[PDB]
Amino acid sequence: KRRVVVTGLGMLSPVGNTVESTWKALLAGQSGISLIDHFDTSAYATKFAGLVKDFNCEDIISRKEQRKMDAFIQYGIVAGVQAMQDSGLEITEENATRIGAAIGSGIGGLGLIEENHTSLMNGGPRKISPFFVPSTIVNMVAGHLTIMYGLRGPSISIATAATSGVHNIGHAARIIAYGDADVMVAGGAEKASTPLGVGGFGAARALSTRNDNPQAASRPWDKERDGFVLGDGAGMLVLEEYEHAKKRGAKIYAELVGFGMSSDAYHMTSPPENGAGAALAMANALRDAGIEASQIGYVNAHGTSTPAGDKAEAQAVKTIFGEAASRVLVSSTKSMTGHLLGAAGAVESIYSILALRDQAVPPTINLDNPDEGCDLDFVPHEARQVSGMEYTLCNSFGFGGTNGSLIFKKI
Amino acid sequence: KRRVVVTGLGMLSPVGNTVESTWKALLAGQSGISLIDHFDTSAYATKFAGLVKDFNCEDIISRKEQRKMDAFIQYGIVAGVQAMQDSGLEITEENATRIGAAIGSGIGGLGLIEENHTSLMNGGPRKISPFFVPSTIVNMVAGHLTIMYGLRGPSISIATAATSGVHNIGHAARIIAYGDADVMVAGGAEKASTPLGVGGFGAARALSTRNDNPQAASRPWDKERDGFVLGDGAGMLVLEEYEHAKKRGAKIYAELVGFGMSSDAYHMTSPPENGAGAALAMANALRDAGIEASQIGYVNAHGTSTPAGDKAEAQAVKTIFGEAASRVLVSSTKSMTGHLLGAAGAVESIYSILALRDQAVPPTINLDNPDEGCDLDFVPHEARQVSGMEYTLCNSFGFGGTNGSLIFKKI
Ligand SMILES: C=C1C[C@@]23C=CC(=O)[C@@](C)(CCC(=O)Nc4c(O)ccc(C(=O)O)c4O)[C@H]2C[C@@H]1CC3
Ligand SMILES: C=C1C[C@@]23C=CC(=O)[C@@](C)(CCC(=O)Nc4c(O)ccc(C(=O)O)c4O)[C@H]2C[C@@H]1CC3
Incomplete structure (x- = not known):
């Protein structure tokens, strides 16, 4: 194998x-x-x-x-x-x-x-x-x-x-x-x-x-x-x-x-409120890796800074992570880098790999006043030190409702 | 499996x-x-x-x-x-x-x-x-x-x-x-x-x-x-x-x-005279299928009607088919359909599938005066009846030197 x-x-x-x-x-x-x-x-x-x-x-x-x-x-x-x-x-x-x-x-x-x-x-x-x-x-x-x-x-x-x-x-x-x-x-x-x-x-x-x-x-x-x-x-x-x-x-x-894939089958330029597509892609990557959501230490989000897009992914993360939802770190590096479109998933996979090497997680900057009912740790403002992080997950979603998630493992 | x-x-x-x-x-x-x-x-x-x-x-x-x-x-x-x-x-x-x-x-x-x-x-x-x-x-x-x-x-x-x-x-x-x-x-x-x-x-x-x-x-x-x-x-x-x-x-x-893939690694808009890339893709598809070139009955060629492109593929077919080269039928349906570009390999795979169903192979029309040293059977002019054809192969090559071959099997 x-x-x-x-x-x-x-x-x-x-x-x-x-x-x-x-x-x-x-x-x-x-x-x-x-x-x-x-x-x-x-x-x-x-x-x-x-x-x-x-x-x-x-x-x-x-x-x-x-x-x-x-x-x-x-x-x-x-x-x-x-x-x-x-x-x-x-x-x-x-x-x-x-x-x-x-x-x-x-x-x-x-x-x-x-x-x-x-x-x-x-x-x-x-x-x-x-x-x-x-x-x-x-x-x-x-x-x-x-x-x-x-x-x-x-x-x-x-x-x-x-x-x-x-x-x-x-x-x-x-x-x-x-x-x-x-x-x-x-x-x-x-x-x-x-x-x-x-x-x-x-x-x-x-x-x-x-x-x-x-x-x-x-x-x-x-x-x-x-x-x-x-x-x-x-x-x-x-x-x-x-x-x-x-x-x-x-x-x-x-x-x-x-590596997980899915399709939202909802709308050409917007995800469903549910975040069901995002969830299925993450679920598929986890099953492909043979691990549980609790083993993920950090999720480099698609998080593009749109009103509806950011909410859908936070819902999908809640759905997949359930109990551990508040314990996994989630951050969007697009807060600094902007949206590299067809290159976003590539640079973001690099960030996800380096986070493993350095046991350090980059922040979602500008997160001054987070959406209300959000329970997640979006690593606002400042990078975060982590300890025994063995797995990172990178999400990338696209127009057409097409979704993908990659999971990297330390060593 | x-x-x-x-x-x-x-x-x-x-x-x-x-x-x-x-x-x-x-x-x-x-x-x-x-x-x-x-x-x-x-x-x-x-x-x-x-x-x-x-x-x-x-x-x-x-x-x-x-x-x-x-x-x-x-x-x-x-x-x-x-x-x-x-x-x-x-x-x-x-x-x-x-x-x-x-x-x-x-x-x-x-x-x-x-x-x-x-x-x-x-x-x-x-x-x-x-x-x-x-x-x-x-x-x-x-x-x-x-x-x-x-x-x-x-x-x-x-x-x-x-x-x-x-x-x-x-x-x-x-x-x-x-x-x-x-x-x-x-x-x-x-x-x-x-x-x-x-x-x-x-x-x-x-x-x-x-x-x-x-x-x-x-x-x-x-x-x-x-x-x-x-x-x-x-x-x-x-x-x-x-x-x-x-x-x-x-x-x-x-x-x-x-299914076979390869890259020519030669020139952005022209294949090498050798047809080595085309050959490797066909070779890869055959190995993927677990069969020999002699078992292919018909090759639906990339054959776009360019001076250098057509010659390179005829060389690659000769290379892969060796002895059987003259016995396999090769035809380019682009002689009638023109080049559908990103859809060419899709319609041509359909032709390759129907040839199996109907035991009939469409012609390369307009082949009035074939290049000299060519020994291959390009099915010129008229469709051809075949008998116990079990495998067809479809080639598609693209700018950038990127090549692909698919093999279909009857039933
Ligand atoms: C269809 C409508 C309703 C609407 C209203 C609120 C919004 O938040 C969005 C702005 C963006 C939706 C979205 O994030 N799609 C969305 C998506 O599904 C998948 C990928 C991306 C991406 O950039 O990679 C993306 O951006 C837009 C798009 C739009 C006009 C206002
Ligand atoms: C670089 C040069 C030299 C040159 C001279 C003789 C030729 O035959 C060609 C016409 C076409 C080469 C070719 O078939 N490429 C070629 C190729 O590699 C891969 C795919 C296709 C395709 O259409 O799908 C294709 O077309 C051209 C392209 C060009 C200008 C004259």
């Missing part, structure tokens, strides 16, 4: 351009939200987001190649390289066939779709770039990374909106456990802070419009919350069959033990 | 709006390619495509709901309903939790992305539709269908360009076989015949420009081939654990026995 462990990490987030710098900022309660400057936000209801500061790929992606990729692909490649380098894995002719990728994105190449469509409108189809398609489509991060590293094993890309990162990580694990691969680079990348992303989610009345205090905007479970905050970035993990990791003397961050 | 069978089929294609009408047209060598009329093609190098004729969803999708969906979603829902109805499955409170969906698309909502971006350019973000995001993103077919049928089991959506349909079908099977579901509606949907789809693939020099004879344009393995022909549609299959199918007295079309 094949076990799957995590042997490499890579990340670009609004609070840091490496895994460790991002994690340091999160334990310190730092916000990565700021005012947008790369487009004129005068007419936008929302004028801020969690941006990647000073992104740099000069040494990683050639200049001939950069021109062929939307920003989300560039972020995903940089984070994937970070992970592959961290793993220390050496690809060979013998290996290549057993190493793959499961990387996606919720929305993909908004920036270059806008650029190409602007060009088409202005000068006709003659002005569309030859790179239009391969520069925007969701699966292009997996495609570039396999080519860059010579990976010939399975490559897939799951695009399930905000659930993408968890699904891609979960299915990469399944692929290894099934026997179709020994190693997979898995995760998600997103750069939706563009006129269409900001204007589009704004049109749906889904974004916070607290322009006068961008850093207080994302405030999960707080009574004054008014929608999510968009965040850009990428998170990647190298997953690897257990015996293969040891035999090569790999450093092992944690083991991936459970 | 859980076996997976196919118990329901649904389809919209350029040669028919049902499964049986489409299959009848294919065995008759009919082309579904025609001149585009829904947009001004004056400035386009390519002015034709395989369109869905007289699409109708009046009785299936409410008018309040249609306005919230790009065409690809509407096609996918109609084909999914066709499949669920064909399966005869009755969803219950007891069942709901064990039935899910794995449905994707290569490019998703081009038409509504263009509409929304046009609106933004013309009148600012105020003019973006509240439905922008949920009307365009790839996972929305799975989302609507789960809500429509009350499906609460796992839902994922794989977007791997032209490989999508095969990946989604293959992973739905894995999900059932793993034990996470007993039933899954799986497939793909695409409607990329828009200014961006036609202009975008045109910019890449990937499309045939034989405007003077649209029906002769798609001509896989023919010396005069000049690129692929874009096709719209959707293909859906209900996959189901074997014992569950029987117990309810389900009609069983075929069993899904093998």
Whole structure:
């Protein structure tokens, strides 16, 4: 029976351009939200987001190649390289066939779709770039990374909106456990802070419009919350069959033990008050891991900072945790990072893994005045020290009612 | 050990709006390619495509709901309903939790992305539709269908360009076989015949420009081939654990026995001359099925009608089939249907299943003057009667070098 462990990490987030710098900022309660400057936000209801500061790929992606990729692909490649380098894995002719990728994105190449469509409108189809398609489509991060590293094993890309990162990580694990691969680079990348992303989610009345205090905007479970905050970035993990990791003397961050999925079957852009879908996904991950809810020490929530979304998950956590509900810690790191969409589940799985390593749990900042009837410990304001935490759980839910939960185990 | 069978089929294609009408047209060598009329093609190098004729969803999708969906979603829902109805499955409170969906698309909502971006350019973000995001993103077919049928089991959506349909079908099977579901509606949907789809693939020099004879344009393995022909549609299959199918007295079309994946690790938009990636995917599907290449009777090829793509797959088939290479039948139905992109692997899996049922193999039409050194039987011109064919294989490859092969077994 094949076990799957995590042997490499890579990340670009609004609070840091490496895994460790991002994690340091999160334990310190730092916000990565700021005012947008790369487009004129005068007419936008929302004028801020969690941006990647000073992104740099000069040494990683050639200049001939950069021109062929939307920003989300560039972020995903940089984070994937970070992970592959961290793993220390050496690809060979013998290996290549057993190493793959499961990387996606919720929305993909908004920036270059806008650029190409602007060009088409202005000068006709003659002005569309030859790179239009391969520069925007969701699966292009997996495609570039396999080519860059010579990976010939399975490559897939799951695009399930905000659930993408968890699904891609979960299915990469399944692929290894099934026997179709020994190693997979898995995760998600997103750069939706563009006129269409900001204007589009704004049109749906889904974004916070607290322009006068961008850093207080994302405030999960707080009574004054008014929608999510968009965040850009990428998170990647190298997953690897257990015996293969040891035999090569790999450093092992944690083991991936459970993966659960469900569908709300309720509404396209809102969860049911019940949180029944969220509950079933967590229940499925627990059964997959062979453990009880009481063994979970910390839940990194989907917690996007929407009025109805936050309430549904708190109900689902109550439902699954029952007695232990008040004893498990729950926190939403989107209070600092914003919502990375298709990359959220990927960076958040990293947070869930590091919490195990460091026995430290990042806070839900801005939780000044929690919803009433809430009995849960949302780790408000300040990080929390924990003791013998052996399991963490990461939730990620998405438009379409699609849900996913991952369970990591220490060592 | 859980076996997976196919118990329901649904389809919209350029040669028919049902499964049986489409299959009848294919065995008759009919082309579904025609001149585009829904947009001004004056400035386009390519002015034709395989369109869905007289699409109708009046009785299936409410008018309040249609306005919230790009065409690809509407096609996918109609084909999914066709499949669920064909399966005869009755969803219950007891069942709901064990039935899910794995449905994707290569490019998703081009038409509504263009509409929304046009609106933004013309009148600012105020003019973006509240439905922008949920009307365009790839996972929305799975989302609507789960809500429509009350499906609460796992839902994922794989977007791997032209490989999508095969990946989604293959992973739905894995999900059932793993034990996470007993039933899954799986497939793909695409409607990329828009200014961006036609202009975008045109910019890449990937499309045939034989405007003077649209029906002769798609001509896989023919010396005069000049690129692929874009096709719209959707293909859906209900996959189901074997014992569950029987117990309810389900009609069983075929069993899904093998699923293989690989990556070319070569170039973003072209396969290696070697066809090594294609070969590895087929090799992996055969090993997964536990059979030898000699047991395959018919290969429904990726065969898109590009100069380099068709040659690479013929090399890969030679490589895998060796001695039997000339004895296996290979055909590309894209010679009639055009390239359905993220739905190609889904409709083509249906063709591969029906070939088993009917012991009849559809032709590669337009194969007037085959590439030289080719020794393979590409079923040129006319359908072929077969005798004791027990296994069919369906290939689907995609930009990014991502490959997939499915193997179906009679009964
Ligand atoms: C349908 C309606 C009713 C409505 C009213 C109150 C709300 O809280 C929300 C804002 C957001 C619902 C939600 O969290 N969905 C929701 C969801 O189900 C799944 C995922 C996410 C995510 O961002 O990843 C998400 O955001 C909206 C969406 C919307 C307009 C007002
Ligand atoms: C990179 C270059 C060189 C080039 C020259 C000859 C060719 O045949 C192709 C036309 C198409 C290659 C191809 O089939 N890729 C290709 C591929 O790898 C995977 C999938 C598909 C598909 O449609 O699903 C596909 O189409 C093109 C693409 C392009 C411009 C000319």
